[PDB]
Amino acid sequence: KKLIPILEKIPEVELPVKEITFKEKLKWTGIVLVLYFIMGCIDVYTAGAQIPAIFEFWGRIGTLITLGIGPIVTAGIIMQLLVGSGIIQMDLSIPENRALFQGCQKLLSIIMCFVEAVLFVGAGAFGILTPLLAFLVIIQIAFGSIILIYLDEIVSKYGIGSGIGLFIAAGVSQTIFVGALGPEGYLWKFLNSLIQGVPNIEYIAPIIGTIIVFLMVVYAECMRVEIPLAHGRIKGAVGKYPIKFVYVSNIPVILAAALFANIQLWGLALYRMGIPILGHYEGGRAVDGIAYYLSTPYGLSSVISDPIHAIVYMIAMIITCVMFGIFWVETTGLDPKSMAKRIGSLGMAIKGFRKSEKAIEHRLKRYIPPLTVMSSAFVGFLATIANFIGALGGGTGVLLTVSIVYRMYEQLLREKVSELHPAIAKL
C-alpha cells in the first residue's frame, strides 16, 4: 500500500508516441528556456518594493522564481537520504519501486515547494512580515517554483537535455554575461575605472577568477576512465570505452552543495524565528555555529583570514559528496544488472577477461563503488577549491554548468544522428 490516491491526483505530462522531430525537441526546449529567463525578470507582487539592500544582491530572490530549483533539489536530497541509508530499503528493479521512489519524490517536491516558500519569508527574505502580504507572497513564490517542476517535465519529455540541468546552466551563464557585461557590468566598471585613471584591480578580479575556474573545471571535465573491450566475437585489441569520471558525480555534488543550501537557510530561518540551534547569523548570513563552519567562502576574493574555517568546509563538503555518491549507488545510478546484457548482446566482455553475463556483471558491480566514490570525493574537492578561488556565477555552479552544457552538446549530437536511422535508439 502507498500514498497512491493523492499521488494519482498529482498531474503529469502527456508523452506522445508520435514523431517529435529534432527541430521540435529543440524549439520546445527554447520555449522553456525563455519563460525561465522571463520569470527571472519579473518581481513578485509586494508593496514593500524593498528587500533590505542586505539580501538584494543575494542571488535571485524577489522574482517569480525566488525559490527556483531549490525545492526540487531538497526533495531529491531526502529520498537519496532515506532510500539511501536503507532506512526504507527498496529494490527499484520492478516498475513499482521505480515509479514509487519517483512519484513519491515528486509529491514531496511540492510539499517542499511550499515549505521552502514559507521558510524563505520566515527567514526574513523580504523584510515586511505583514501576515496578509506574507501569505500572498508565499503563494506566488512556491507556485512559480511549481511551474519549473512542470516546465521540467516538459523539457524532460518534449525537448533535449534536462530542465534542472538547463535551469542551472541557464542561470550561471546568465549570471556571467550580465555580471561581467551588463548594465552595472564589471568589465565596464573596470575599463571605466581605467579611463578615470584609478586602475581598480578589484573590478576585473572576479572576471579573471571565473576564467581560471572555467579553464580548470574544463580540464577536469576531460579526464576519463578508459576501459578496454573484448572483441565482439572477432579477435585482437578492440574497444577502449571511456567513462565521464567527473559527470559521474554530477547530480551528486548538486545534492551536496544543495544540502548546505538548506542548512544556511534553515539556520537563519530557525534563528529569527526561534532558538539558535544551528548558528548565530546576524548581518544576514551566519557568523557562528554549524552554519558558519558550513558556509562557502567565495564571491569575489578568497578569504585566507580563517584557515580552520576552510579546512573544515572542504572536509565537510568532501564527505557529504562521497555520501550522496554512495546513496546514488544503492539507488538508480550505474546498475550492472542492465549493463549486463547491454554489453552481452554485442558480446563485448572487458579487456581483462570473462565473456559471460554473471561474469562481466560481477567485474562491473565490483569496479563501480570505488569509481563512484573516487569521482565524487574529487569533484566535491574541486568544486570546493573552485569556490575558494571564487568566480562569477559560483565556482561550484560554473562547474555543474560546464558539465551540464557539454552533456548537452552530446545530447544534441546523439540527436542529430538518431535523426537518420529510425531504430538504433539504444546503441
Curated annotation (Swiss-Prot):
Q: Which residues lie on this side of the membrane: Cytoplasmic?
A: 1-27, 83-104, 156-162, 222-249, 326-376, 407-427
* Species for this entry: Methanocaldococcus jannaschii (strain ATCC 43067 / DSM 2661 / JAL-1 / JCM 10045 / NBRC 100440)
Q: Keyword set for this entry?
A: Cell membrane, Membrane, Protein transport, Translocation, Transmembrane, Transmembrane helix, Transport
Q: Which PROSITE patterns match?
A: SECY_1, SECY_2
**Which residues lie in the membrane yet do not traverse it?**
59-63, 64-82
Assembly behavior: Component of the Sec protein translocase complex. Heterotrimer consisting of alpha (SecY), beta (SecG) and gamma (SecE) subunits. The heterotrimers can form oligomers, although 1 heterotrimer is thought to be able to translocate proteins. Interacts with the ribosome. May interact with SecDF, and other proteins may be involved.
Q: Where in the cell is it found?
A: Cell membrane
Question: GO molecular function, one example?
Answer: signal sequence binding
Q: Where is it mostly found? A: membrane
Positions in the Extracellular compartment: 46-54, 124-134, 186-203, 272-306, 392
Protein name in the entry: Protein translocase subunit SecY
Biological process annotations from GO: SRP-dependent cotranslational protein targeting to membrane, translocation
Q: Return the annotated site residues (Pore ring).
A: I69, V73, I168, S173, I254, L400
Residue ranges spanning the membrane: these are 28-45, 55-82, 105-123, 135-155, 163-185, 204-221, 250-271, 307-325, 377-391, 393-406
In the UniProt record, does the keyword Transmembrane helix occur? Answer: yes
